[PDB]
Amino acid sequence: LSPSMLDKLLRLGYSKLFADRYFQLWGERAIRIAEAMEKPLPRCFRVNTLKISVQDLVKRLNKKGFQFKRVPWAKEGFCLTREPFSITSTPEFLTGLIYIQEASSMYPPVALDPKPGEIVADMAAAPGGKTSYLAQLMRNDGVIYAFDVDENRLRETRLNLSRLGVLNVILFHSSSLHIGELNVEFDKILLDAPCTGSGTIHRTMDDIKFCQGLQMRLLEKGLEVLKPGGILVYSTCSLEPEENEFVIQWALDNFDVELLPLKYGEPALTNPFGIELSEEIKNARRLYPDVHETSGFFIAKIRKL
Structure with missing residues (x-):
């Protein structure tokens, strides 16, 4: 672990122990993982198929100006790319047609x-x-x-x-x-x-x-x-x-x-x-x-x- 990467990890708040551990596990990628982790995650939602199909919910949201991409591992999950107004202020969310949660949690x-x-x-x-x-x-x-x-x-x-x-x-x-x-x-x-x-x-x-x-x-x-x-x-x-x-x-x-x-x-x-x-x-x-x-x-x- 170079003095440079070490210092960068130390500045992010890591102890030398954890910095050494992460470098031993992922090498130079360690810094890329640590820094990527400081960034906020997109807001994602899951279609509640107990109340509406994925196809129908998507059409309804798109019509309102929202745009989103599929979460690879969950057919009912999508992450927002365009959130005109708060997704939690939509009737879809208020009536239980969608649930907000992180992509990984799906x-x-x-x-x-x-x-x-x-x-x-x-x-x-x-x-x-x-x-x-x-x-x-x-x-x-x-x-x-x-x-x-x-x-x-x-x-x-x-x-x-x-x-x-x-x-x-x-x-x-x-x-x-x-x-x-x-x-x-x-x-x-x-x-x-x-x-x-x-x-x-x-x-x-x-x-x-x-x-x-x-x-x-x-x-x-x-x-x-x-x-x-x-x-x-x-x-x-x-x-x-x-x-x-x-x-x-x-x-x-x-x-x-x-x-x-x-x-x-x-x-x-x-x-x-x-x-x-x-x-x-x-x-x-x-x-x-x-x-x-x-x-x-x-x-x-x-x-x-």
């Missing part, structure tokens, strides 16, 4: 691909946007269990779901870590971490450990209640291998699971810091702010054997 639900009639769980700490995406993909059939320790937030979410016309979600005022006490066997599980990790960047080695441990605990509880042949999608908004590839490798070594292929993004890292991981990890994907216009993102699709 990937997990779509990858999980819940089907109508299935028993699903969203293990998010703050259920919301992804939970309603699961609901429309399930066409208001099946069941979705979600957990939030914050009653006020849970109340807010229940109102959002009402506006969206979601009828198959059950919200519990508890931590998803207690999912095992329900004595329910799940077809699909969404284990999405809050998009505030190293991938968001506007941390300490300790904070990385805490999240890694919590991630491991959550993943184990999720796999525990998952039916054989069931699917769990794991995702984070962190660039750290410790919260991503390391957790997935641990799962592959610790449980009877296998990874399934995912289409979008770049291959996950199989030699982070010179640590050789299973080639199978390449089934996992990463989104980078320097090429995908999203926060740092990681996603893996796991099938229980």
Whole structure:
């Protein structure tokens, strides 16, 4: 790492440790990822197919002056390129025809691909946007269990779901870590971490450990209640291998699971810091702010054997 790039990373607010880590993981691209991450993301939205088709919603918005591009990994997602006036001031948004969320946050639900009639769980700490995406993909059939320790937030979410016309979600005022006490066997599980990790960047080695441990605990509880042949999608908004590839490798070594292929993004890292991981990890994907216009993102699709 040259004194130049180092200084640039230090100025962005990185410690020498993280600067050295990022350079060891991506070399000169490290600076491009760090700088791209300081920029604001476009405003994106998801069409609520529970209330309107994608084709119809698009025609309605275009007619009003809005222009947008498709999010590659989600047929219902689009990111604005022309927002005459606030998209949240439109009748479309106010009547629940669209939902505003980051492009990356659309990937997990779509990858999980819940089907109508299935028993699903969203293990998010703050259920919301992804939970309603699961609901429309399930066409208001099946069941979705979600957990939030914050009653006020849970109340807010229940109102959002009402506006969206979601009828198959059950919200519990508890931590998803207690999912095992329900004595329910799940077809699909969404284990999405809050998009505030190293991938968001506007941390300490300790904070990385805490999240890694919590991630491991959550993943184990999720796999525990998952039916054989069931699917769990794991995702984070962190660039750290410790919260991503390391957790997935641990799962592959610790449980009877296998990874399934995912289409979008770049291959996950199989030699982070010179640590050789299973080639199978390449089934996992990463989104980078320097090429995908999203926060740092990681996603893996796991099938229980």
